[PDB]
């Protein structure tokens, strides 16, 4: 998959510094376009970053801060768009990269040619050379009056001169292959971009970063939209009009807008709108419904929208950081929550600022009916009287449209829970899972983490948990009645996939049909007690169904 959602985490410290380099690699591996921000923060000096060699396009900004790596291999990145900016002013931010000595040594951005919107921020880098020898105006867009240069030139080492074979002195490295390709300040006439000085070498008006010819199907990047190799200005409409009567007829060439490309259908986790936009949230007077196949769709409604529940970051909870006792009553009977759910340390104990009562462990029973979360789940505190997360038994799917820190969709931190708690969690739509620094945490490696993910960019990061050798040597090892050794925790319950038969929520063996007081009928390996008040039998099947007609008498 070449479309990977980026991270949303500024200079803020990581959750688990040990499993951080394993978080960047499990997210930008085999990716070419980043639908978000590219943030490279808090990397050790000897970290290997070979997985960042294929990044080409970034929708958001580029953040490179607090790193001791000598080289960042982002040599094949052409265009950064800048839909959202760092401090609302910058599109490229290289800060605080310093301690043979460690720290960033060279920028190594050889193909950067177009920044549509934003600025560049380079401050406090002692080991960085060649940072002020680049004509940054060329890389900035023609329609960008926000292009402000803030470059710090405080260096702790002596730099080398650029390669003499380079025409001028604009180089990103000392080697001969580190020159800069001037594109905009060398054009002849009113050409926004040109591959050379000749007017015939001018690029098409839809070329973003450059061109390999005069045509409109060979731009290095598409300025507005990418129509399967055709740099267009708009995606083809989803409907055609009679233009006299103006009637609606479906267009077989209808494409949907998804970032900077035209797509036949919206991606798996996204939503398709009648206007022709791949959304994560339906617009006003629209509604999210499931089609016959099972895909997600934003569909209109004449009647007012049904009352839905909202979580953190959503309509009236856009600024709440954790679930307190003030908003705990809102999630009453909500079979679906539009938004996230966070439990910070300040949730189960009252806040001195206000008269906030602390979260009693019996108040968390309102979540015993929740079945779907469209955002992340973040539990960094949990009562010690509750051994697991058994309040989320009915939680089936966490879609992860909104990700905590921009990467994680299921995070547990310092809980001290017993095994896992999460019984029926069967799907993580997007974002990684991070279960770390829980001392009494067993049952981590025995979860079908591949049967819950939905894309190759999802993974499981875990560290500083209970050692596995101590977990097995206690009699807690996925009781064998669970099929294929996939268990959620100790007991006849917590089996991910049953092997023989079910009796309610617990994994059981051959039913009590022939030797039980309630006579049962096995429907897809499910013991179900039915009262045989027609004919007491002693080893024969009494009832075929729950109705009176199916009874023996």
């Amino acid at each position: 998959t070449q479309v990977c959602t980026g991270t949303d985490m500024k200079l803020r410290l990581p959750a688990s510094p040990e499993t951080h380099l394993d978080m960047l690699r499990h997210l930008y591996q085999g990716c070419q376009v980043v639908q978000g921000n590219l943030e490279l923060t808090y990397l050790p000096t000897n970290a290997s970053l070979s997985f960042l060699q294929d990044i080409q396009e970034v929708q958001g900004y580029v953040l490179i801060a607090h790193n001791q790596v000598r080289q960042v291999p982002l040599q094949r990145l052409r265009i950064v768009r800048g839909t959202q900016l760092f401090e609302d002013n910058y599109a490229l931010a290289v800060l605080d990269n310093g301690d043979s000595p460690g720290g960033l040594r060279e920028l190594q951005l050889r193909s950067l040619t177009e920044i549509l919107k934003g600025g560049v921020l380079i401050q406090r880098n002692p080991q960085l050379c060649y940072q002020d020898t680049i004509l940054w105006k060329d890389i900035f867009h023609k329609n960008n009056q926000l292009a402000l240069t803030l470059i710090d030139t405080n260096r702790s080492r002596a730099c080398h001169p650029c390669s003499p074979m380079c025409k001028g002195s604009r180089c990103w490295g000392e080697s001969s292959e580190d020159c800069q390709s001037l594109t905009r300040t060398v054009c002849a006439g009113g050409c926004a971009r040109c591959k050379g000085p000749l007017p015939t070498d001018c690029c098409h008006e839809q070329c973003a970063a450059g061109c390999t010819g005069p045509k409109h199907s060979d731009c290095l990047a598409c300025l507005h939209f990418n129509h399967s190799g055709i740099c267009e200005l708009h995606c083809p409409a989803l409907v055609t009009y009679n233009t006299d009567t103006f009637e609606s007829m479906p267009n077989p060439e209808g494409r949907y807008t998804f970032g900077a490309s035209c797509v036949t259908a919206c991606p798996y986790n996204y939503l398709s709108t009648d206007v022709g936009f791949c959304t994560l949230v339906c617009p006003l007077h629209n509604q999210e419904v499931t089609a016959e196949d099972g895909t997600q769709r934003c569909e209109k409604c004449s009647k007012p929208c049904a009352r839905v529940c909202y979580g953190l970051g959503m309509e009236h909870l856009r600024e709440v950081r954790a679930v307190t006792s003030a908003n705990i009553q809102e999630f009453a009977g909500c079979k679906k929550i539009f938004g996230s759910l966070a439990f910070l340390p300040e949730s189960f104990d009252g806040d001195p600022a206000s008269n906030t009562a602390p979260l009693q462990p019996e108040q968390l029973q309102v979540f015993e009916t929740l079945e779907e979360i469209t955002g992340y789940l973040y539990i960094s505190a949990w009562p010690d009287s509750l051994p697991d997360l058994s309040v989320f038994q009915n939680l089936q799917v966490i879609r992860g449209r909104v990700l905590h820190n921009g990467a994680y969709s299921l995070t547990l931190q310092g809980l001290g829970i017993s095994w896992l708690g999460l019984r029926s969690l069967r799907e993580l739509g997007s974002g990684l899972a991070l279960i770390h620094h829980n001392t009494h945490l067993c049952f981590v490696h025995t979860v079908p983490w591949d049967q819950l993910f939905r894309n190759p960019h999802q993974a499981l990061l875990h560290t500083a948990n209970r050692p596995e050798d101590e977990c097995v040597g206690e009699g807690l090892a996925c009781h064998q009645l669970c099929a294929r050794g996939h268990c959620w925790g100790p007991g006849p319950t917590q089996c991910v996939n049953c092997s023989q038969f079910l009796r309610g929520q617990e994994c059981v063996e051959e039913c009590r049909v022939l030797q039980g007081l309630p006579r049962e009928y096995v429907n897809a390996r499910h013991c179900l007690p039915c009262h045989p008040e027609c004919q007491p039998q002693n080893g024969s099947v009494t009832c075929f169904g729950p109705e009176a007609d199916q009874c023996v008498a």
Partner: antibody
Amino acid sequence: EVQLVESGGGLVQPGGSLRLSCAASGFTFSAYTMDWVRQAPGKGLEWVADVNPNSGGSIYNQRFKGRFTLSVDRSKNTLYLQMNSLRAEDTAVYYCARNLGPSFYFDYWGQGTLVTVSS
Amino acid sequence: DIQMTQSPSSLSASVGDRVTITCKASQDVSIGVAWYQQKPGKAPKLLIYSASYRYTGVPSRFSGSGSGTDFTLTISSLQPEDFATYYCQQYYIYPYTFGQGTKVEIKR
């Protein structure tokens, strides 16, 4: 908060051309259908046209098709309305509303820039 | 084209009375009818959609009704803020045409 500001209003001779703009903010631009409405001085309201931000497919009125020309610039959340061959009936205030779902009713109108034509 | 006609074109009422405004179309626009409000000099604001549902952020002293060709906008209690012009509109079929306006003003 959603707020829309129009511009381009002024005074031109009959037959002259103008181009009204309507910048949007506070909401996702490429998610709603954008519109232009006009009201003659001391008269009622008259829907003018209809534009789509993603495809660009514009829906005009039969009395205005051929003279007016809509456009969309998603790079700066701006609408464009090119008026050509203005007659003496084109003196009014030009609102700039938006669709909720692509059924033609409005909730968040603009400010109502004024266009007047006279010799 | 559909002619969207209100009746009456002008009305006077005191604060606290009951105001009834009727709009009528020349074609079947059963539930494709909205309502608006324009004070002198400021831009219009949505009040009713689908002829029976209020918009978010609108007081409860508004109740549209009527289906087919007859429609009605009613205010249960008047306040010294809703003295303005009330328009009706149809979006059921192209073209989409507003009404001529109904002016509601204080009585003495």
